[PDB]
Amino acid sequence: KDPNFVHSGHGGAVAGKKNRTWKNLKQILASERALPWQLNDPNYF
DNA sequence: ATCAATATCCCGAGTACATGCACAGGATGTATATATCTGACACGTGCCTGGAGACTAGGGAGTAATCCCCTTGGCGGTTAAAACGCGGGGGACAGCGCGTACGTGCGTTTAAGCGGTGCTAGAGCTGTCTACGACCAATTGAGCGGCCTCGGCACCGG
């Protein structure tokens, strides 16, 4: 009745006390900024 | 130096809502054991508070003259009090509903720990240099003086 019954978490807050859904968008962009983007490389910034 | 007219207190009776006690229970006070650092105790230290001396003089203690504010007494005008009647709004009972407190679930946010390092503090002697003492020349103001003009009374004229 469902595609899968063995669905696994992708970094939720079941263990810790962080946000249950996912990281905040500001945090997502802050983490993505750490990538060694090239000088002419496109990004979300 | 008393008697009427009120007002108040005392006592008795019908009455009722709030005090005081028992019940079920639940959640906070208690007993036991562990970790640990805050504060008692000792030590030296050196800042500074307490004691006395002598000299200067600003300030206080004592006296005398006196004009002024304080206080008592007296009187006129009136603003409030006491009590009457008139009039309105405070006061005593039922129906809604929207606020306030629990209950439940979530995540953002401060505490804690550990290096890192400019950063506020203290004594250093630093040097300027405003600001406290002393002297001196500006205006402001009141207490006086000189002189002139006006007005009332005594003397002579008709």
UniProtKB/Swiss-Prot annotation:
Q: The organism sits in which domain of life?
A: Eukaryota
The membrane spanning regions, by residue number, are: none
Where is coiled-coil annotated?
none
The entry's localization annotation reads: Nucleus
- Quaternary structure and partners: Component of the chromatin remodeling INO80 complex; specifically part of a complex module associated with the helicase ATP-binding and the helicase C-terminal domain of INO80. Component of some MLL1/MLL complex, at least composed of the core components KMT2A/MLL1, ASH2L, HCFC1/HCF1, WDR5 and RBBP5, as well as the facultative components BACC1, CHD8, E2F6, HSP70, INO80C, KANSL1, LAS1L, MAX, MCRS1, MGA, MYST1/MOF, PELP1, PHF20, PRP31, RING2, RUVB1/TIP49A, RUVB2/TIP49B, SENP3, TAF1, TAF4, TAF6, TAF7, TAF9 and TEX10.
The role this protein plays is: Proposed core component of the chromatin remodeling INO80 complex which is involved in transcriptional regulation, DNA replication and probably DNA repair.
- Protein name per UniProt: INO80 complex subunit C
Q: Which organism is it from?
A: Homo sapiens (Human)
